[PDB]
Amino acid sequence: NEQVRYAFHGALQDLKSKPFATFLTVMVIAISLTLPSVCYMVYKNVNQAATQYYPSPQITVYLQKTLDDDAAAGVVAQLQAEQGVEKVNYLSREDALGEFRNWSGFGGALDMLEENPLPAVAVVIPKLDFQGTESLNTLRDRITQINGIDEVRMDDSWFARLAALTGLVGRVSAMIGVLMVAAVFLVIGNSVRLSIFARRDSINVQKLIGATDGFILRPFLYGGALLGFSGALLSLILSEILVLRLSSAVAEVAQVFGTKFDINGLSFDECLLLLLVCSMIGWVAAWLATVQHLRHFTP
Amino acid sequence: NEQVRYAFHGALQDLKSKPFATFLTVMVIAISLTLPSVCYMVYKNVNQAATQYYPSPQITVYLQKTLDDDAAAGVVAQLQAEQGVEKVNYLSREDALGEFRNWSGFGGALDMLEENPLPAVAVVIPKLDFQGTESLNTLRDRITQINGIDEVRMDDSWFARLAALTGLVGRVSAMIGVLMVAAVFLVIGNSVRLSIFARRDSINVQKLIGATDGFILRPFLYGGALLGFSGALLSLILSEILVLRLSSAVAEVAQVFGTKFDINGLSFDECLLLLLVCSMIGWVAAWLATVQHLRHFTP
Amino acid sequence: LKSIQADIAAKERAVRQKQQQRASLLAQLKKQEEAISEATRKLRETQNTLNQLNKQIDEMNASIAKLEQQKAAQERSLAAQLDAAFRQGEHTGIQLILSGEESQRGQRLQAYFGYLNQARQETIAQLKQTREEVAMQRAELEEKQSEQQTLLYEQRAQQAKLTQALNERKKTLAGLESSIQQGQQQLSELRANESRLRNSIARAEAAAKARAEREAREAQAVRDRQKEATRKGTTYKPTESEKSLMSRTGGLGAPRGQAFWPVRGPTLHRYGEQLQGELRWKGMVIGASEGTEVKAIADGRVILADWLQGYGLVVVVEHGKGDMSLYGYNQSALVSVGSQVRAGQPIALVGSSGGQGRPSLYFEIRRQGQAVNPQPWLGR
Amino acid sequence: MIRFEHVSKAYLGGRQALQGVTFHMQPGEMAFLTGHSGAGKSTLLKLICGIERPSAGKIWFSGHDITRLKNREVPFLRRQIGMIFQDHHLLMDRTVYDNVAIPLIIAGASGDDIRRRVSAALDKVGLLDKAKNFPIQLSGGEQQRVGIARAVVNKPAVLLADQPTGNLDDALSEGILRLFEEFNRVGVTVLMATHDINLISRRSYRMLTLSDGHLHGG
Amino acid sequence: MIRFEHVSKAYLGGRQALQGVTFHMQPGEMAFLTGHSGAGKSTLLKLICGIERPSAGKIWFSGHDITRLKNREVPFLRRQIGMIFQDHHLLMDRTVYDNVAIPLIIAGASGDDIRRRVSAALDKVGLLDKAKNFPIQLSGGEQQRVGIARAVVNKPAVLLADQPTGNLDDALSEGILRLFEEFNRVGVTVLMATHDINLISRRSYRMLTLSDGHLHGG
Ligand SMILES: Nc1ncnc2c1ncn2[C@@H]1O[C@H](COP(=O)(O)OP(=O)(O)OP(=O)(O)O)[C@@H](O)[C@H]1O
Ligand SMILES: Nc1ncnc2c1ncn2[C@@H]1O[C@H](COP(=O)(O)OP(=O)(O)OP(=O)(O)O)[C@@H](O)[C@H]1O
């Protein structure tokens, strides 16, 4: 199998013949490709990564004055632990008294307005039982049908505020990703096509000496896969310089706002896939260009 | 005069010689250029919406019983009109009586509860120097605990959260923008360089008679601007078609979760700037690439 | 000749006028006792009105506490519940919340913001009800105080008129106290004066006499029915109304001091002893300072409360079976001609009316129209 | 092993280069193709080799019709002949050793055999001194001789020469003609298009003249 | 006007193309340049043009030393010279009218004069019928004569021909030589490098011979 070795040697020599032309082509492929691989940090890190629950209606029924310490278990024995519910958030009586004081609601009226009649209640976490939309909905009033709980401030939450992200955001970023994953194909294909167009003369010369249809192809394919592979490898060398640099900024805003979002890098399971995809793109572009320019010299 | 026409005609001739290659190059340039335009659109629209939402709060020091007309004048001479303050919102006494009545809180208790002890609100927007939370920090407490008003309704650091979000939508989008402009820089440069390399065989003009370097250059400069300009022209058409697609869906979501804050396009000045910058970059790349060849074809 | 007759007339001129003035203006003193009876009824009404005014002042103090402390402190609280939108609260909070809302939605739904406003509305309804009730209680206290004040003004006018009348009658009473009488004159003119006083007493007794006989007959019928029920193998228990009707004036019974004490005070004279001359004492006399009362020795009907010479506006409350221990020199009148008064319950507060120098409760034990010994008539 | 039966070739545009050419060349036969400038010589050689297609008539090569040849069987026709072009059609980015050795590589020969055969064929024209040079570093006659060495390196069955002695002086032209004759003494049919009158006047070979696309020479 | 004084040229790599060349050529003097292959003829013509730089000695053209010419003055020297190369060095994507006319475009001449002069120069070499064909649609001799027509169009002062007859038959060779003579009878200095003998034997002109970069004639 000396043909494979000879073709690889020819492709390597052709690439090394113009160091400034080869380097300036690898440079544009790597920069045009780090954008998909750095914008994938955002949708893998942060978004999805730090998924903190959602506006779920833990809101529940409002208990009357009959609620007490014993009635808390009784409500649990009926709706807060027997019907659809996961957790217990019964802040009855003094529990939602100092917390209500230190919230946005200012205190001091309790010492003046006799006693605060904080309408009793108990936020719940509708477990599978009532979790289901309809499992709640109808049985949501059935959940109310438990112990006392005069009222039922059970709510919904999320509202349209949970649409200005599943809608506007759910299309624009995908569109941008599609744009980038078309740009990379286009730039690799254009570079390889122009490389073959530069040396079409040798194609013609060695075609009219005999040769074959496949002999002329191999040095151009191996030189088109090696251009995509070498341009993707430098994008992985990059896109870690940028992400580690960006880690400092994200770490600073972690404490200022609250929960500390943790940044990370690209994994091997996606690095290998990226290298393979770029190699295949370069190979297929080289095949297309050479086959197009091989039917030109067939009078 | 005539040389300009001859050079332009030659540039158009060699552009139209190979329609597929020039079309592919233009498509690559336009695809690589429609990303930063969309990023700048979304950044500008988000910035406009954030500026329209809330520039600064109106939280001030809550006045005690010592507040009066003369005490309000003193509070103006101290903080409300002499210290960091943009306007005056001294709603003392009856000013914050009907306003409280028509606010979310139901009124009518004044006829029963003797006289309403409405506070002397002294809202004022601090200047840019005092706008900063870090600048506010101790001075904000110092301004509150200066004289007159006793209590202090401090801010909830909503401005700080907006500032951190802006810093992210700054640093990160700035790095994305510089990456995109580098990408288009290298795409234009490489395409022009490779076209000149393919048509390099015109050592004949340099060797034949005194075709000075100025004579040789002009067909290549004008053919470099015509490539960058056509890339920018196709991007503007492609960019605006794309946002119209992602506008009707985006605008509807804004109406549900607030107000229908739609997406605008580019002003005429922005389009002219884009076209001029792309043509300039193409001209520079053509000059560099040709001067590279004019030196290695000399004795 | 004529000189002897003129001297005799001069010596015997003014005795008859003095005695007549004494008797007539002692009757006028008893009339002053009746006027003081009207004044004392007005004074009891004024005391009831003063107790009502004191209760109204206590109710005004309770209204002060409840409603005015509501106003001051609990309306600091109420206007702070409203200040949760007006003074250091809300300001129409519509700002969007951040991720992980620590309440701040449950808050405005029902918690330190939403249930704050809900309990504020509940307490505002409660305070509107409290203000309406404060207005209603102020109206009620004002009506009570206006009743008290109108009664006080009317009673003051009536008491001023009665005081002028009593001053005139007191001048008359002094004119009465001017004179005295002689011995055989005592026998004759005292028979006459007692006849007049007992004539007034018997007018009152004829007005209020049927009650004792009716009650005695009712008690006898009740006893006969109870006895006959046993003869028929049953028990005849009179109803509440029947028992009340039967036992109203069932009679005085044996004198054993089982009734309410008419008044507390020392006793000077004894029944059957030497009171005035050879005539046997009508009954025991409670000799003490003026103002000590007197009443019947047992439950029954008042036989007399009206002006009478010597015994004043005597409350001759008949204890039944003819036993009427009169309230000598009584200065009041409660059970007039037609009404009834029991033992202890005085038809008139005794005093120094009718010419008597002080309260001498000459409780005559009239048994079959004759004086009886009252010594063993005190047991409890 | 070459037969032209009423062949005609007109290029796209309206220039009738060849009209009614018929002739025959036997296995192992030399001939000279002569004509004026623009006559149709390189067109005839292109038709034989396989580069161009006739508009009419038939071409028979080695007894098998090639007037309509599939694009898959052409490389096995162009492999039996050694063609010497007029542009010298060199690979200017390779060495001259690689240029001469590429036919053996195409045919699939070994390594030491390639080295020996390339050295022999480069010695036969005098260019062994210049086996490490790129074709840019050679004169015109030396590039011509590199092409000639490339042609004969694979022991062909036909030699098709297109003015192979231009840019060569008379001594070198005679040497190259002697090399062709020594290849033809083995049984290689030669057909050599030439503009030289002195070179052909000193030898007795069949001579096909061609006057404006009309053979009338044989 | 041309003058060489002990000029030598060793190409980078260790190949002494020329050594110790010295000669003088007056205005309006025709001469031939002959030698074997690889002698160093095209190198002499390149030194005269300015494409290559001598490693020693001095070169004078029209009385101005050009051995150390700058890079901003080579254009005017190359304008004063009409040269025809061995590769014909002609643009493959322009009509032959444009190829012949580019020297006039560079010189800065009007339009009617350009058309008239290009027609005359194309007719002199017999190509006027092909004024619209691209160079790919010509033969070897026709491309040669396109190069000749481009050279002689600008009425030069020195004409440097580098084998302008190879690829041309004998009648066309005589026609080309007669054209160069009709240019030289005005006062144009002609230096013609060639190694065909039937042309430089029937005309008596000075002949400079080279043999491995040493002028054996002068
Ligand atoms: N590619 C081409 N397309 C069209 N016509 C062509 C082409 N090549 C040559 N011709 C024309 O065909 C005719 C013959 O050309 P050909 O190449 O056969 O000439 P030739 O005999 O090689 O000439 P020379 O002796 O000068 O080399 C001429 O009219 C020529 O201009
Ligand atoms: N670019 C070059 N680099 C190195 N050596 C070169 C170069 N061009 C030519 N030579 C060498 O210089 C010498 C003379 O070459 P040149 O082309 O001047 O000869 P020539 O007489 O024109 O040849 P021919 O008669 O075959 O056309 C030869 O040894 C040749 O190989």
Side-chain angles (χ1 to χ4, degrees), chain D residues 9-11 13-15, chain E residues 137:
Chain D
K9 162 91 194 143
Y11 290 91
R15 194 141 300 154
Chain E
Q137 282 147 58

Side-chain angles (χ1 to χ4, degrees), chain B residues 187-208:
Chain B
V187 166
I188 276 151
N190 190 43
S191 288
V192 176
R193 195 194 44 84
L194 270 178
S195 316
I196 280 166
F197 187 88
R199 314 171 321 101
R200 154 211 51 190
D201 40 294
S202 279
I203 165 177
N204 324 135
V205 193
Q206 156 106 333
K207 182 155 46 53
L208 163 149

Side-chain angles (χ1 to χ4, degrees), chain A residues 12 29 37 162 231 237 265 289-291 293:
Chain A
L12 259 177
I29 290 173
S37 69
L162 250 286
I237 291 307
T290 290
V291 163
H293 218 308

Side-chain angles (χ1 to χ4, degrees), chain A residues 55 57 71-74 77 81 84 96 98 102 105-109 117 119-120 122 126 132 148 159-160 162-171 173-179 181-194:
Chain A
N102 82 2
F106 64 101
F159 23 96
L162 250 286
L165 97 145
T166 185
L168 175 131
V169 169
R171 324 311 311 300
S173 186
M175 142 174 145
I176 275 191
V178 165
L179 272 194
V181 308
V184 55
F185 294 44
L186 264 288
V187 63
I188 302 191
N190 188 36
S191 319
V192 184
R193 175 164 320 233
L194 272 180

Side-chain angles (χ1 to χ4, degrees), chain A residues 169-171 173-179 181-194 196-200 202-239 241:
Chain A
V169 169
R171 324 311 311 300
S173 186
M175 142 174 145
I176 275 191
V178 165
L179 272 194
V181 308
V184 55
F185 294 44
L186 264 288
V187 63
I188 302 191
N190 188 36
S191 319
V192 184
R193 175 164 320 233
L194 272 180
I196 281 85
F197 186 86
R199 322 171 269 150
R200 70 181 171 289
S202 95
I203 282 175
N204 172 37
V205 163
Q206 93 186 105
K207 171 151 216 55
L208 54 82
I209 309 170
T212 325
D213 231 320
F215 183 90
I216 314 184
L217 257 165
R218 266 190 279 257
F220 294 93
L221 298 190
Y222 294 0
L226 273 192
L227 201 51
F229 176 91
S230 99
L233 175 65
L234 184 89
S235 158
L236 298 180
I237 291 307
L238 212 42
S239 162
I241 271 289

Side-chain angles (χ1 to χ4, degrees), chain A residues 43 45-46 49-50 55 57:
Chain A
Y43 159 79
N45 246 152
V46 208

